[PDB]
Design a protein around this ligand. Structure first.
Ligand SMILES: CC1CCN(C(=O)Cn2nnc3ccccc32)CC1
Ligand SMILES: CC1CCN(C(=O)Cn2nnc3ccccc32)CC1
Lengths: 305, 305
């Protein structure tokens, strides 16, 4: 027992990280088969940052301008292409450490692990959620661009995120591995509205189920509710609306605990209306929304990769 | 910016994990050079668990009774020895994936990353602290025994923890890699007192400095205190006493922020006496004590491995 904010083991991704340098700018790249993926803003200078003309900037570059280094080994760049906001550098060597992988565009409210890297070397790994407003609340310093987010299923790494930007508000924005930003964001040094965020209701409920499984019992009450009644409360507290699709994915946790989903909703309603009264759940004094129902079952059942 | 409960990249440790089977019991082992380390209770049955005579149980075992499997490869066991509560199985092959490593016995209040494994395969990685009472609050299911905790400095893995036991209270106990338990615990299925735990004061202060660095500003006040006055408050709230050695290791964070350590202590005093008033610090509604001052500087400066 016990419940932790657990990340995927990062070894398969560590072997794909490289350093990419174009002129003055060094960031991280992802080396998969014979292609290196990295943020296109590696080709900018500080003159460029307020609104770079990336097409014009890239036309001034040749294959030999992109320095790609994997540890101490230099890779030979034999082609380059810009796809949306990512650069794809073809190299003459396939990465011998390439895992089985896919590129996935995740949905808001899903979770993934981030391997934070600097100069192509790993610094740390942590778990986070894609917020409903398509930002992430990460831990990124200058030089972390090109660090990736991922999930692992069996032996397959699903890459879902590449880091590009810290907004002036201190939250983080990035792309899928085809270079399409999550959210309304563009790769320019500008104030950019992220828009209203909400709490991920289905994840809070999953975590309350995790709490019951691990022995935090105290928030269970004698009440139930309806999906309408609950969603009126969710709206007042800036929680995402709960749908039958969410009730369905909570099915396994409801069956394991014997607590019907709408009974758990009534416990969450009371917590929203009355607070925690100074008490804690799974070591937290707030309602946690960075565990999906899949995450809770995985951690409570010991799935390996 | 941003601050996350970050683990070390786990790849160097993933390549050392194996499965060890003795009779009916399967758990994890750590394969370093030509030795596999694992908890000695792999040799028990459920008859044995209330008070195993490990010397007698091991005398009934031979090298060929220990099945050690690294992925799909079987290792040949050519010797076995019991050191305190760990078994050391000499194998005829050195692990080609052995990193530079050392064995370290950590102090209470220090942090490390845990690679949770089942059947020799990694499941997840998370960061945690050794509690002042020498337990850890982990996430471990049956079959996780032999999972290890570690730190990484440059290219060297310092192994500090091997998982052995979940106490009836739901907290976790284990050994250093010489098999010596942290704390008063023994490897028997019995109720075992852990004794009073406390909050790790120097870590809370480090995290308050992390908060300031990242823009949580609101708990700073117009007050200061003394080490005596503060420690009277620490005692009342079951916080560890603060020493000049702790003030010294907080020096770098004090210099970066310009906030004297005793001024930060006065902010913490007010938080202990008055609570958070429904507000949050770095996404938490309680005072966080699982970041050391070294952790905060590392994450705020982007150290890689
Ligand atoms: C086009 C241009 C937009 C602005 N920008 C970034 O924000 C890069 N970045 N990303 N994460 C960061 C964390 C700390 C500091 C800088 C960070 C550079 C690229
Ligand atoms: C000597 C004997 C003591 C009791 N014991 C354990 O507690 C093993 N263990 N460790 N972590 C666990 C998490 C869930 C269930 C069991 C777990 C087995 C060995």
């Amino acid at each position: 027992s016990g419940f932790r904010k657990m990340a995927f083991p990062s070894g398969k991704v560590e072997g794909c990280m490289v350093q990419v340098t174009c002129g003055t700018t060094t960031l991280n790249g992802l080396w998969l088969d014979d292609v290196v993926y990295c943020p296109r803003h590696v080709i900018c200078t500080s003159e460029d940052m307020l609104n770079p003309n990336y097409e014009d900037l890239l036309i001034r570059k040749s294959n030999h301008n992109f320095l790609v280094q994997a540890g101490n080994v230099q890779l030979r760049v034999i082609g380059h292409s810009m796809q949306n906001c990512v650069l794809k550098l073809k190299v003459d060597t396939a990465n011998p450490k390439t895992p089985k992988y896919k590129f996935v565009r995740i949905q808001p409210g899903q979770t993934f692990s981030v391997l934070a890297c600097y100069n192509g070397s790993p610094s740390g790994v942590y778990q986070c959620a894609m917020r409903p407003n398509f930002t992430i609340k990460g831990s990124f310093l200058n030089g972390s661009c090109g660090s990736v987010g991922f999930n692992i299923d069996y032996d397959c790494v699903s890459f879902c995120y590449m880091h590009h930007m810290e907004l002036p508000t201190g939250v983080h924005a990035g792309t899928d591995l085809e270079g399409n930003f999550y959210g309304p964001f563009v790769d320019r040094q500008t104030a950019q509205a992220a828009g209203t965020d909400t709490t991920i209701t289905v994840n809070v409920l999953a975590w309350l189920y995790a709490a019951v499984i691990n022995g935090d019992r105290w928030f269970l009450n004698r009440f139930t509710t309806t999906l309408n009644d609950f969603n009126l409360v969710a709206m007042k507290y800036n929680y995402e609306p709960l749908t039958q699709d969410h009730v369905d994915i909570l099915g396994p946790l409801s069956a394991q605990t014997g607590i019907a989903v709408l009974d758990m909703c009534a416990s969450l309603k009371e917590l929203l209306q009355n607070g925690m009264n100074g008490r804690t759940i799974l070591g937290s004094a707030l309602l946690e929304d960075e565990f999906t129902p899949f995450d809770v079952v995985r951690q409570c059942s010991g799935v390996t990769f």
